[PDB]
Design an enzyme around this catalytic site. Structure first.
Site, PDB file in Angstrom:
ATOM      1  N   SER A 171       0.625  -6.152  -0.505  1.00  0.00           N
ATOM      2  CA  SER A 171      -0.798  -6.390  -0.824  1.00  0.00           C
ATOM      3  C   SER A 171      -1.127  -6.875   0.957  1.00  0.00           C
ATOM      4  O   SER A 171      -0.932  -8.016   0.767  1.00  0.00           O
ATOM      5  CB  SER A 171      -1.288  -7.727  -1.792  1.00  0.00           C
ATOM      6  OG  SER A 171      -1.848  -8.254  -1.768  1.00  0.00           O
ATOM      7  N   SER A 172      -2.706  -6.570   1.054  1.00  0.00           N
ATOM      8  CA  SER A 172      -3.430  -8.081   2.379  1.00  0.00           C
ATOM      9  C   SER A 172      -3.183  -9.261   2.352  1.00  0.00           C
ATOM     10  O   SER A 172      -3.302  -9.415   3.628  1.00  0.00           O
ATOM     11  CB  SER A 172      -4.467  -6.756   2.304  1.00  0.00           C
ATOM     12  OG  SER A 172      -5.488  -7.527   1.382  1.00  0.00           O
ATOM     13  N   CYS A 173      -3.249  -9.263   0.950  1.00  0.00           N
ATOM     14  CA  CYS A 173      -3.077 -11.194   0.954  1.00  0.00           C
ATOM     15  C   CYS A 173      -1.994 -11.282   1.469  1.00  0.00           C
ATOM     16  O   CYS A 173      -1.419 -13.030   1.392  1.00  0.00           O
ATOM     17  CB  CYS A 173      -4.171 -11.819   0.637  1.00  0.00           C
ATOM     18  SG  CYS A 173      -3.199 -10.716  -1.557  1.00  0.00           S
ATOM     19  N   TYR A 189       2.486 -15.929  -4.858  1.00  0.00           N
ATOM     20  CA  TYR A 189       2.066 -14.570  -5.134  1.00  0.00           C
ATOM     21  C   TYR A 189       2.422 -13.506  -3.410  1.00  0.00           C
ATOM     22  O   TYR A 189       3.689 -12.319  -3.810  1.00  0.00           O
ATOM     23  CB  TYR A 189       1.049 -14.333  -5.357  1.00  0.00           C
ATOM     24  CG  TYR A 189       0.463 -12.786  -5.667  1.00  0.00           C
ATOM     25  CD1 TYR A 189       0.155 -12.487  -6.864  1.00  0.00           C
ATOM     26  CD2 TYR A 189       0.234 -12.465  -4.905  1.00  0.00           C
ATOM     27  CE1 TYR A 189       0.105 -10.748  -7.007  1.00  0.00           C
ATOM     28  CE2 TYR A 189      -0.739 -10.638  -4.500  1.00  0.00           C
ATOM     29  CZ  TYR A 189       0.046 -10.489  -5.607  1.00  0.00           C
ATOM     30  OH  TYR A 189      -0.497  -8.557  -5.642  1.00  0.00           O
ATOM     31  N   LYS A 228       6.153 -10.709  -3.467  1.00  0.00           N
ATOM     32  CA  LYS A 228       5.740 -10.037  -2.896  1.00  0.00           C
ATOM     33  C   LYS A 228       6.682  -9.072  -1.860  1.00  0.00           C
ATOM     34  O   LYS A 228       6.889  -8.143  -0.925  1.00  0.00           O
ATOM     35  CB  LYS A 228       3.861  -9.334  -2.618  1.00  0.00           C
ATOM     36  CG  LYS A 228       3.581  -8.860  -3.453  1.00  0.00           C
ATOM     37  CD  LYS A 228       3.703  -8.156  -4.690  1.00  0.00           C
ATOM     38  CE  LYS A 228       2.843  -7.920  -5.485  1.00  0.00           C
ATOM     39  NZ  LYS A 228       2.525  -6.732  -6.680  1.00  0.00           N
ATOM     40  N   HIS A 242     -12.944 -10.474  -8.073  1.00  0.00           N
ATOM     41  CA  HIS A 242     -13.743  -8.953  -7.195  1.00  0.00           C
ATOM     42  C   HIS A 242     -15.049  -9.100  -7.358  1.00  0.00           C
ATOM     43  O   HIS A 242     -15.950  -9.090  -7.856  1.00  0.00           O
ATOM     44  CB  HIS A 242     -13.010  -8.162  -7.714  1.00  0.00           C
ATOM     45  CG  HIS A 242     -11.652  -7.228  -8.436  1.00  0.00           C
ATOM     46  ND1 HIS A 242     -11.410  -6.406  -8.331  1.00  0.00           N
ATOM     47  CD2 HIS A 242     -10.653  -8.319  -7.873  1.00  0.00           C
ATOM     48  CE1 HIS A 242     -10.450  -6.733  -8.770  1.00  0.00           C
ATOM     49  NE2 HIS A 242      -9.272  -8.004  -8.280  1.00  0.00           N
TER      50      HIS A 242
HETATM   51  N1  LIG Z   1      -4.877  -6.737  -1.528  1.00  0.00           N
HETATM   52  C1  LIG Z   1      -4.648  -5.689  -1.957  1.00  0.00           C
HETATM   53  O1  LIG Z   1      -3.917  -5.039  -1.257  1.00  0.00           O
HETATM   54  C2  LIG Z   1      -4.454  -5.286  -3.555  1.00  0.00           C
HETATM   55  C3  LIG Z   1      -6.106  -5.554  -4.508  1.00  0.00           C
HETATM   56  C4  LIG Z   1      -4.961  -5.004  -6.169  1.00  0.00           C
HETATM   57  C5  LIG Z   1      -4.019  -4.575  -6.194  1.00  0.00           C
HETATM   58  N2  LIG Z   1      -2.873  -4.451  -4.608  1.00  0.00           N
HETATM   59  C6  LIG Z   1      -1.702  -3.755  -5.532  1.00  0.00           C
HETATM   60  O2  LIG Z   1      -1.528  -4.289  -6.863  1.00  0.00           O
HETATM   61  C7  LIG Z   1      -0.814  -3.857  -7.622  1.00  0.00           C
HETATM   62  C8  LIG Z   1      -1.322  -4.721  -8.731  1.00  0.00           C
HETATM   63  O3  LIG Z   1      -2.868  -4.899  -8.924  1.00  0.00           O
HETATM   64  P1  LIG Z   1      -3.546  -4.027 -10.516  1.00  0.00           P
HETATM   65  O4  LIG Z   1      -5.214  -4.661  -9.163  1.00  0.00           O
HETATM   66  O5  LIG Z   1      -3.182  -3.014 -10.686  1.00  0.00           O
HETATM   67  O6  LIG Z   1      -3.127  -5.191 -11.457  1.00  0.00           O
HETATM   68  P2  LIG Z   1      -3.112  -4.985 -12.664  1.00  0.00           P
HETATM   69  O7  LIG Z   1      -4.223  -4.213 -12.562  1.00  0.00           O
HETATM   70  O8  LIG Z   1      -3.582  -6.345 -13.844  1.00  0.00           O
HETATM   71  O9  LIG Z   1      -2.679  -4.522 -13.887  1.00  0.00           O
HETATM   72  C9  LIG Z   1      -1.450  -5.238 -14.182  1.00  0.00           C
HETATM   73  C10 LIG Z   1      -0.172  -4.179 -14.808  1.00  0.00           C
HETATM   74  O10 LIG Z   1       1.301  -4.524 -14.625  1.00  0.00           O
HETATM   75  C11 LIG Z   1       1.684  -4.793 -16.247  1.00  0.00           C
HETATM   76  N3  LIG Z   1       2.302  -5.698 -16.603  1.00  0.00           N
HETATM   77  C12 LIG Z   1       2.237  -6.957 -16.070  1.00  0.00           C
HETATM   78  N4  LIG Z   1       2.900  -7.873 -16.383  1.00  0.00           N
HETATM   79  C13 LIG Z   1       4.793  -6.913 -16.811  1.00  0.00           C
HETATM   80  C14 LIG Z   1       5.647  -7.375 -17.554  1.00  0.00           C
HETATM   81  N5  LIG Z   1       6.121  -8.464 -17.093  1.00  0.00           N
HETATM   82  N6  LIG Z   1       5.810  -6.276 -17.654  1.00  0.00           N
HETATM   83  C15 LIG Z   1       5.634  -4.929 -17.516  1.00  0.00           C
HETATM   84  N7  LIG Z   1       3.790  -4.151 -17.333  1.00  0.00           N
HETATM   85  C16 LIG Z   1       3.583  -5.682 -16.522  1.00  0.00           C
HETATM   86  C17 LIG Z   1       0.065  -5.399 -16.685  1.00  0.00           C
HETATM   87  O11 LIG Z   1       0.711  -4.712 -18.314  1.00  0.00           O
HETATM   88  P3  LIG Z   1      -0.545  -5.588 -19.505  1.00  0.00           P
HETATM   89  O12 LIG Z   1      -1.906  -6.020 -18.456  1.00  0.00           O
HETATM   90  O13 LIG Z   1      -0.745  -4.032 -20.298  1.00  0.00           O
HETATM   91  O14 LIG Z   1       0.020  -6.313 -20.012  1.00  0.00           O
HETATM   92  C18 LIG Z   1      -1.056  -3.400 -16.856  1.00  0.00           C
HETATM   93  O15 LIG Z   1       0.096  -2.389 -16.629  1.00  0.00           O
HETATM   94  C19 LIG Z   1      -1.163  -5.962  -6.782  1.00  0.00           C
HETATM   95  O16 LIG Z   1      -0.183  -6.243  -7.300  1.00  0.00           O
HETATM   96  C20 LIG Z   1      -0.794  -5.889  -5.619  1.00  0.00           C
HETATM   97  O17 LIG Z   1       1.037  -5.291  -4.941  1.00  0.00           O
HETATM   98  C21 LIG Z   1      -3.418  -5.137  -3.783  1.00  0.00           C
END
Ligand SMILES: NC(=O)c1ccc[n+]([C@@H]2O[C@H](COP(=O)([O-])OP(=O)(O)OC[C@H]3O[C@@H](n4cnc5c(N)ncnc54)[C@H](OP(=O)(O)O)[C@@H]3O)[C@@H](O)[C@H]2O)c1
Length: 286
Positions: free
Chosen positions: A110-112, A139, A143, A182
């Site tokens: 993640s950028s943060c 967090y 990561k 967001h």
């Molecule tokens: N600034 C950045 O660089 C930036 C911004 C956004 C994302 N990202 C990267 O992308 C990642 C995901 O971001 P997102 O926005 O996609 O998050 P999200 O939309 O909240 O997706 C979370 C996913 O993980 C699942 N999950 C959570 N706890 C779990 C567990 N214990 N077992 C199995 N599955 C589980 C959730 O399942 P349910 O919700 O169906 O339970 C959902 O499928 C971040 O962690 C980060 O590394 C980076």
């Protein structure tokens, strides 16, 4: 191309997520066997169930988009949950992947999680060179530990495990909740409630479908150990962003260095105005 996904079994962890669903969408085009597990059936913090799922299905490729993510209020009030959930997911999947010899693994940073005061634009080697931002340090530490565990497996064993460092994401399955953190959803929201009511610094935004494309690109072409930023490139100011937003709705210092992904011949292909309008109408029709 160092690696071809065709014929391979690809486990997309967290496929209901914003990033996970974008990967799954980009993958169903591909000639591969896609494997998913809903959060309701496989808690990826549970080492036992996670290992048996990895040892039973034996994917060639694991894409870890499962995570606990949220805004500033959530991170500062539930730091233990934001650290533990994310760290245990990464540890359980990386360890299980190393044990059976998973050919490729992708962890998402993640950028943060770069140091708060590191020089802009952020190069990947700025990682750990300074103090973390306190509000999401828990967090970030999770990561970072997952990234470094993937790195240690690549170093010690030659496991082809990589980490991508995205930036602010928008597009499909974004969070339009009134409590969403967001910026862009809330802007479309605040400007729309102002449009039908008739009232009187630089930022970066990456389209989730570009990010998904870049992740498969890294998987196909990138073999390094170090992380790879996936940025937007096209910047915009909150000032300029508001005028772009207001024109969509009819109303009346955190940027990544992308040298590395550019040397891989990848660049985002969705323009901000195209994605915003395409997302403005989906929010209406939904
Ligand atoms: N600034 C950045 O660089 C930036 C911004 C956004 C994302 N990202 C990267 O992308 C990642 C995901 O971001 P997102 O926005 O996609 O998050 P999200 O939309 O909240 O997706 C979370 C996913 O993980 C699942 N999950 C959570 N706890 C779990 C567990 N214990 N077992 C199995 N599955 C589980 C959730 O399942 P349910 O919700 O169906 O339970 C959902 O499928 C971040 O962690 C980060 O590394 C980076």
């Amino acid at each position: 191309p160092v690696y071809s996904l065709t014929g391979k079994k690809i486990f997309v962890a967290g496929h209901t997520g914003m990033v996970g669903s974008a990967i799954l969408r980009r993958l169903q085009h591909e000639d591969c066997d896609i494997i998913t597990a809903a959060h309701s059936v496989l808690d990826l913090t549970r080492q036992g169930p996670t290992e048996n799922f990895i040892s039973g299905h034996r994917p060639d490729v694991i894409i870890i988009a499962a995570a606990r993510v949220g805004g500033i209020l959530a991170n500062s009030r539930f730091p233990a949950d934001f650290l533990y959930d994310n760290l245990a997911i990464g540890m359980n999947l990386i360890h299980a992947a190393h044990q059976i010899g998973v050919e490729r693994l992708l962890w998402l940073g993640s950028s943060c999680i770069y140091p708060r005061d590191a020089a802009q634009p952020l190069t990947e080697d700025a990682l750990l060179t300074g103090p973390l931002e306190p509000t999401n340090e828990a967090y970030a530490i999770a990561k970072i530990a997952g990234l470094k565990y993937a790195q240690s497996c690549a170093r010690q064993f030659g496991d082809r495990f990589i980490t991508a460092m995205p930036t602010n994401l928008y597009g499909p399955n974004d969070n339009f909740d009134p409590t969403s953190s967001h910026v862009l959803p809330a802007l479309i929201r605040r400007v729309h409630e102002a449009r039908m009511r008739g009232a009187e610094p630089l930022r970066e935004f990456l389209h989730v479908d570009d990010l998904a494309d870049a992740c498969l690109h890294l998987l196909r072409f990138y073999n390094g150990i170090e992380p790879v930023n996936i940025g937007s490139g096209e910047e915009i100011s909150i000032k300029e962003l508001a005028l772009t937003v207001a024109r969509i709705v009819g109303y009346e210092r955190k940027l990544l260095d992308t040298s590395r992904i550019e040397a891989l011949g990848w660049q985002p292909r969705i323009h901000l105005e195209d994605g915003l309008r395409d997302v403005y109408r989906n929010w209406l029709e939904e």
